[PDB]
Design a protein around this nucleic acid. Structure first.
Length: 247
DNA sequence: CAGTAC
DNA sequence: GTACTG
């Protein structure tokens, strides 16, 4: 086909962006089969190619819910203290979802530790997790898993699933980051910068030092933020509900 | 870099 | 914007 369309097609493989799609184009590849048979794939790109059709579909809210529940049940078995919340589009209340992002913490502030591997291992035994894409354990106290699940029974599609485990200390900022939206997060972070602060999935910080070109050269003090509302407050912002964050 | 997460 | 691994 024409160049713009083939680039779009390749681009829709998880793990491949413009640069990879152009490289594959120059190799002479024009179809997904070409890629599957001749291209050098990353483990992740291989999985994205396998689930290429499925990953293109959004899912109904119901399925997202069902998926969060599947995760919730497994985690709770370890500790019923655990709190699991589905974020992303779901929290924002959208009708359909592209993926499910499940945030996890313990009000305890302690018991959340050591759940991450077990939870994953448990979900693997169950047949629920089908492929693994990325694991992040260099997140300080947050662990992120990016993967692929599939609900039991016939006619079910492979869905993209993220699972994050954070300390209660940072629940608010994590919650805030994971429900987004992306354009929304960009806006609060931009704003904070203006006020001499910084925002991340870990903390809001004040007294952030910056130089003449604007570059962060000093971390601030971390401001305790037990709820999302505390974050909006300290930034001098009317609070907004997740559905109001769908920018 | 590239691709990804929101 | 912030920040992770491939």
């Amino acid at each position: 086909s024409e160049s713009v369309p083939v680039l779009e097609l390749f681009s829709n493989i998880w793990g491949a962006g413009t640069k990879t799609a152009q490289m594959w184009y120059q190799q002479g590849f024009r179809s997904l089969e070409d890629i599957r048979s001749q291209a050098s794939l990353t483990t992740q790109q291989a999985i994205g190619l396998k689930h290429y059709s499925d990953f293109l579909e959004r899912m109904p809210r119901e399925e997202a819910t069902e998926i969060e529940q599947t995760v919730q049940k497994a985690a709770q078995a370890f500790n019923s203290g655990l709190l699991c919340v589905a974020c992303g589009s779901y929290r924002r209340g959208k009708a359909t979802c592209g993926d499910v992002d499940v945030l996890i913490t313990h009000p305890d502030g302690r018991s959340h530790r050591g759940i991450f591997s077990r939870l994953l291992d448990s979900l693997r035994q169950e047949g629920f997790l089908t492929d693994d894409l990325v694991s992040q354990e260099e997140n300080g106290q947050q662990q992120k898993y990016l993967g692929v699940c599939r609900l039991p029974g016939p006619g079910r599609r492979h869905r993209r699933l993220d699972i994050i485990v954070v300390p209660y200390s940072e629940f608010a900022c994590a919650l805030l980051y994971f429900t987004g939206s992306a354009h929304f997060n960009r806006s609060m972070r931009a704003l904070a910068k203006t006020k001499g602060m910084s925002l991340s999935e870990h903390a809001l910080s004040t007294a952030v030092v910056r130089n003449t070109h604007g570059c962060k050269v000093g971390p601030g003090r971390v401001l305790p933020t037990p709820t999302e509302k505390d974050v909006f407050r300290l930034l001098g912002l009317p609070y907004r509900e997740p559905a109001e964050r769908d920018w």
